[PDB]
């Protein structure tokens, strides 16, 4: 179901020697995933932490660290160069002593590595707050060309059915400019899973039903998006009905690009987005793939604390894909 | 879900409850009204021109058995209704204004419900949801300690039965509103024989994220719990924590709700509307249309382009609210 969706991603990744950093080097979820990722030669994992400590941990887990490189921030050669690169990136917001201290942190150390090409993407989260990962991601690595913010999408899958849900994790109260962006970026992220983008901007009314600030926010969001990205198939201010079921599409709003065949649903607020994917998961019995960030210069992703060893493996597959 | 209605029809049938249907020339209502009277479930009152309705029912192969017809241009108590309206409008309406206002199906029918000539109204099949709720709030009003109405939905799939908090009326509810939506929704759940277990939803569980949005709800929980002690409801849950027990003891134990909520209060209209719909179209749950709550007398809004049976069930629900 969701599983063959990953085999499609692993297809694209495997054999390209993509390097992904895993800052939580002592976490068995990461060690197991890393150990196996290297074993099958899918990608080249880099782990951060004390080499002896990790080596011994891997052993009590009956693991081996085959094609796995280990970097210790208290040993790395290029630290001084990294320290210097960081201060330059922080534009004076960081002294040298600050930089040095900052980079002794797993997540920061690993983010700098991805920033300076020593790694292609980072994957942390199994033992940190979601902020502790996205923070450096935004201070060091930044958002792409015309992107101002990151968003968290979720791949929803149930059998043949595959959808993308727009920012159900990062941005709390997105505005018109934000939504339009969430929609454009989510549409591109869906390309990575070989989905043909058909965006629908959700709200509690369809193209006019109710007229309040909240509906106009999204309506405006559609203008912005359509203007900024003409070719992308997306119409806006739909209720889930109109966006998901065709009968309702021609009734509530015909003449619209979307004909009840939306496969990318942009939610109006984090409250809708979060409760949304969760209701779809627990009630609709859809498989839900955890937050996937988007719009950054280099791939960075947040695993769920208390996640799964296979969850670590797949995020890596997705993160590597974003890099390719 | 269908058996959920038989539970309501159980309570209603035989009590001679009178419900007004302002849209007298709508076949959805005529078919529903014709059938309700046919089974002697409730006593339907229809508004409009008698010859005109009588003739329309004829082209639908319907009879208007136990169905009373009121015409605003003929009703004998108009004068008294007009006067009662001006009094209720506390001077906001002149006499000429009231007279005109009451020639309107919805207003006329609302007045009947207000003066006891009917027990509840059911409109919406051919008017905006605003056009129904307007007079309901101008004439009839909210109960004792209620300030606003809320639109709940009954969600049903097989054995599963839940209530969804205001997915239709209030756009941007605040702490006081949410607490209310919760107490009222919980009561409305009693009507369907559901044992209330409210969960105030958000994007974080008892602390996860701290922003205005989470506090708004957290505050809502205080208000509600203080205002209504005995009601089992804990707050600021993510759908996980509220629906699946495994997630309850992890994200937040010691809480009254143990992943067994059956009344879900949404933080905003964007969340609630998108919510019940995703639950319906994706979760394959049966969703009964907006059911208003908290008013002095039952009033409900059908969806334009609804179903004849939809009208029939909304009447069952509205009659129940009157009992």
Swiss-Prot record, chain A:
Query: What GO cellular component entries does it have?
Result: cytoplasm
Q: What is its EC number?
A: 2.3.1.8
What does the similarity note say? Answer: Belongs to the phosphate acetyltransferase and butyryltransferase family.
Q: What does the record list as GO biological process?
A: acetyl-CoA biosynthetic process
Report the top EC class in one word. transferase
Where it sits in the cell: the answer is: Cytoplasm
SS bond list: none
Starting at the broadest rank, the lineage of the source organism is: Bacteria, Bacillati, Bacillota, Bacilli, Bacillales
> What InterPro entries would the database entry show?
P_Ac_Bu_trans (IPR012147), P_AcTrfase (IPR004614), P_AcTrfase_dom1 (IPR042113), P_AcTrfase_dom2 (IPR042112), Phos_Acetyltrans/Butyryltrans (IPR050500), PTA_PTB (IPR002505)
Q: In which pathway does it act?
A: Metabolic intermediate biosynthesis; acetyl-CoA biosynthesis; acetyl-CoA from acetate: step 2/2
Q: What is this protein called?
A: Phosphate acetyltransferase
What Pfam families does the record point to?
Answer: PTA_PTB
Q: Is this entry keyworded Metal-binding?
A: no
Record carries keyword Transferase: yes
Q: Which GO MF terms are attached to this record? A: phosphate acetyltransferase activity
Query: What does the UniProt keyword field contain?
Result: Acyltransferase, Cytoplasm, Transferase
The record lists the catalysed reaction(s) as: acetyl-CoA + phosphate = acetyl phosphate + CoA
Domain of life, per the record? Bacteria
């Amino acid at each position: 179901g969701m599983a063959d969706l990953f085999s499609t991603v692993q297809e694209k990744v495997a054999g390209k020697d993509v390097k992904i950093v895993f800052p939580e080097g002592l976490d068995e979820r990461i060690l197991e995933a890393v150990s196996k990722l290297a074993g099958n030669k899918v990608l080249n994992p880099i782990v951060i932490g004390n080499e002896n400590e990790i080596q011994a941990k891997a052993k009590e887990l009956n693991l081996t660290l085959g094609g796995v490189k280990i970097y210790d921030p208290h040993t790395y050669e290029g630290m001084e160069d990294l320290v210097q690169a960081f201060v330059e990136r922080r534009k004076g917001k960081a002294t040298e002593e600050q930089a040095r201290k900052a980079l002794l942190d797993e997540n920061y150390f690993g983010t700098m590595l991805v920033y300076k090409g020593l790694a292609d993407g980072l994957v942390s989260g199994a033992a940190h707050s979601t902020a502790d990962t996205v923070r450096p991601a935004l201070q060091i690595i930044k958002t792409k060309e015309g992107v101002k913010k990151t968003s968290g999408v979720f791949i929803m899958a149930r059998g043949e059915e595959q959808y993308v849900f727009a920012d159900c994790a990062i941005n709390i109260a997105p505005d018109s400019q934000d939504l339009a962006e969430i929609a454009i970026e989510s549409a591109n992220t869906a390309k990575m899973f070989d989905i043909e983008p058909r965006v629908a901007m959700l709200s509690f009314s369809t193209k006019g039903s109710a007229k309040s600030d909240e509906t106009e926010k999204v309506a405006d969001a559609v203008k912005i998006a359509k203007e900024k990205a003409p070719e992308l198939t997306l119409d806006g201010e739909f209720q889930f009905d109109a966006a998901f079921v065709p009968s309702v599409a021609e009734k509530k709003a015909p003449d619209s690009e979307i004909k009840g065949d939306a496969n990318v649903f942009v939610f109006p607020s984090l409250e809708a987005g979060n409760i949304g994917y969760k209701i779809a998961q627990r009630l609709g019995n859809f498989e839900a793939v955890g937050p996937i960030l988007q719009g950054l210069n280099m791939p960075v992703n947040d695993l769920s604390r208390g996640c799964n060893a296979e969850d670590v493996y797949n995020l890596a597959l997705i993160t590597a894909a974003q890099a390719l």
